[PDB]
Structures are given as structure tokens and as C-alpha cells.
């Protein structure tokens, strides 16, 4: 699809048998989601944003569905105020910025 | 053109007749630039992201050229880690997300 940006680009994702709303975010290197449980090992990480840094849990090779794209990648879990889909998954769905 | 997301979608912009690199950021409602001078009246605003808020100066009706497209709009200035082009201007150059 072509998504115009008059609104926040929020879409449905499916992860860990849960449906969630998330933000398609070209300004994020990584995908970060609000507090949740994922299976398997993780490693602590710090990520930075506009107003400073937060600590997150890094989970690798997590399957996630984004607008009917079934993909697999790294998912960060921590106190982001909005679920964020970053470049690591946007590339996986063939997402480009066009003008 | 069509910009891929393997790397940060950074572009050259010209503002106050100064050339800078800025990030095309679909996860930002607004455009915020690192500390600089802009002419005219401004008012203070808080903006927040991952990890909290920063205080910025809101300047309106500011000309800015983004990858060769000349637009005029609201530009925020403050302690952002990077120059950010937000949806308020992305929409003005006809930028869409496409997959």
C-alpha cells in the first residue's frame, strides 16, 4: 500500500499470539515495543531518542506479522510510549519513502 | 525518488541559507533541528519521544528546502540529538510510505 502521512502511520502487528497497534517509523533504527513477555533469551540494551535514553530487553529472531507480512527479527522491549516498527523490519517488508 | 531504509534516510536540507543533514522521520509529528538561529518570534514547546521530553523553540512560517523541494512551515529548534524532518513537512513535499 501507499500510506500518506497526514496522520500517524499506525498499523496492526501480530506478535507472540497478540495483536497490537504500532507506528511505522523511518526515524527508528530498531523496533521497540511496550512491556510484554517474549520467549527465549534476551540481552540488555540502551537505546536513545529525542529526550534521552531508555533501557530495553533485546530479543533476537522473533517472528512478527506487519500488514500481512510475516517476518522475523530483533525486537526490543521496554518503556517506549508507543509501539514502534523500525528500519530493521521496514526493510524486511520492502518499505520505501517515496516523493 | 524512492529512498530505501537499509541506512538512515538522511537528506540534505537548506535552511537560513545553511546546508545540513536531516532525518526523514515518519515517527515524528514535527520537525526539530539542533540548536541554531532562526529569525522572528518564537514560542516555547515541549516535545517528547523515547526517553522523555525536551524544551524547544517553535518558529512558524520558516522556509526550508528538503531534497530540492522548497516548502514553508513550522520548525522547532532545540537539543535534539539529530536533525529531524517530521510529518508536518513530509506531507508538504508529497512524501509517502510504500510497500
Amino acid at each position: 500500500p501507499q500510506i500518506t502521512l497526514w496522520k500517524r502511520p499506525l498499523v496492526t502487528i501480530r506478535i507472540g499470539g497478540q495483536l497490537k497497534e504500532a507506528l511505522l517509523n523511518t526515524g527508528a533504527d530498531d523496533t521497540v515495543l511496550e512491556e510484554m513477555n517474549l520467549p527465549g533469551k534476551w540481552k540488555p540494551k540502551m537505546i536513545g531518542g529525542v529526550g534521552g535514553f531508555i533501557k530495553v530487553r533485546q530479543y533476537d529472531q522473533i517472528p512478527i506479522e506487519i500488514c500481512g507480512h510475516k517476518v522475523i527479527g530483533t525486537v526490543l522491549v521496554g518503556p517506549t510510549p508507543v509501539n514502534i516498527i523500525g528500519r530493521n523490519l521496514l526493510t524486511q517488508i520492502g518499505c520505501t519513502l517515496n516523493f | 525518488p524512492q529512498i530505501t531504509l537499509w541506512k538512515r534516510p538522511l537528506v540534505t536540507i537548506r535552511i537560513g541559507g545553511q546546508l545540513k543533514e536531516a532525518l526523514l522521520n515518519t515517527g515524528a509529528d514535527d520537525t526539530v533541528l539542533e540548536e541554531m538561529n532562526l529569525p522572528g518570534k518564537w514560542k516555547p514547546k515541549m516535545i517528547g519521544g523515547v526517553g522523555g521530553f525536551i524544551k524547544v523553540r517553535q518558529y512558524d512560517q520558516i522556509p526550508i528546502e528538503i531534497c530540492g523541494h522548497k516548502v514553508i512551515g513550522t520548525v522547532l529548534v532545540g537539543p535534539t540529538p539529530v536533525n529531524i524532518i517530521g510529518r508536518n513537512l513530509l506531507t508538504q513535499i508529497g512524501c509517502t510510505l510504500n510497500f
Binding site: 507506528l23 517509523n25 526515524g27 527508528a28 533504527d29 530498531d30 521497540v32 540494551k45 540502551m46 537505546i47 536513545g48 531518542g49 529525542v50 535514553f53 517506549t80 510510549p81 508507543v82 514502534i84 523500525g86 | 532525518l23 522521520n25 515517527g27 515524528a28 509529528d29 514535527d30 526539530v32 516535545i47 517528547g48 519521544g49 523515547v50 521530553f53 535534539t80 540529538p81 539529530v82 529531524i84 517530521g86
Partner: peptide, 10 residues
């Protein structure tokens, strides 16, 4: 509300 979601892997 928060509205600028830049995110950096440092």
C-alpha cells in the same frame, strides 16, 4: 503527548 519518536541504536 509524546510525538517525536526518533530512535537510536547508539
Amino acid at each position: 503527548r509524546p510525538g517525536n519518536f526518533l530512535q537510536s541504536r547508539p
